[PDB]
Amino acid sequence: MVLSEGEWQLVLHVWAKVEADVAGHGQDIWIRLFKSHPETLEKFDRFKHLKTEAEMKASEDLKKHGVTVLTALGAILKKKGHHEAELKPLAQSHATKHKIPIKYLEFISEAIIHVLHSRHPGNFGADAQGAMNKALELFRKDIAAKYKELGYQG
Numbered sequence: 750m751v752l753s754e755g756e757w758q759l760v761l762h763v764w765a766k767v768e769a770d771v772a773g774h775g776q777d778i779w780i781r782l783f784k785s786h787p788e789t790l791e792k793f794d795r796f797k798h799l800k801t802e803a804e805m806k807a808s809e810d811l812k813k814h815g816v817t818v819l820t821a822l823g824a825i826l827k828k829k830g831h832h833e834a835e836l837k838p839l840a841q842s843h844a845t846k847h848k849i850p851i852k853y854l855e856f857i858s859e860a861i862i863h864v865l866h867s868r869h870p871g872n873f874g875a876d877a878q879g880a881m882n883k884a885l886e887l888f889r890k891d892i893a894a895k896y897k898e899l900g901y902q903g
């Protein structure tokens with residue numbers, strides 16, 4: 750797929766608000782994911798033991814990890830499609846070490862969209878959401894392709 754410059758602009762416009770509080774957005778997203786699709790929490794030997802939302806909120810480790818994830822994703826979005834180098838190390842670890850199915854990347858995509866919709870209604874109307882969804886689909890398609898080359902696909 751290819752986004753237009755206008756679609757990238759909508760994406761990087763909301764993302765700039767997200768970057769006002771990276772750790773707080775990281776928290777909401779992971780907590781949204783873990784509550785909605787609890788099976789995803791099983792992938793983290795680090796976080797598996799967390800029983801409640803209150804425990805998740807209070808985990809300093811989880812908050813650091815959310816900042817690591819959103820900074821990696823932010824660096825990809827700012828490439829505006831030219832993200833091949835960034836994608837390589839991320840595809841290799843998630844396919845080969847962590848073993849994360851494309852399905853789970855769809856689930857977190859959903860969690861990111863939910864959280865931007867709640868926090869940023871003014872900057873996340875239908876068009877901006879359409880553009881963010883396009884950007885994350887692009888991300889998933891390219892990652893899926895890399896999975897396949899690395900011998901995991903799926």
Ligand code: HEM
Pocket residue numbers: 789790792793794795817818819821822838839842843847849853854857
């Ligand atoms: C927007 C999508 C994602 C991004 C950009 C991302 C990024 C990262 C980064 C940058 C790291 C640290 C370096 C590395 O191991 O590659 C990491 C580690 C990890 N990621 Fe992700 N990730 C994403 C989605 C997911 C999902 C959906 C799962 C599982 C449901 C997953 C599970 C893990 C695991 C298990 C680790 C290791 C955590 C640890 O013990 O430190 N990732 N991820």
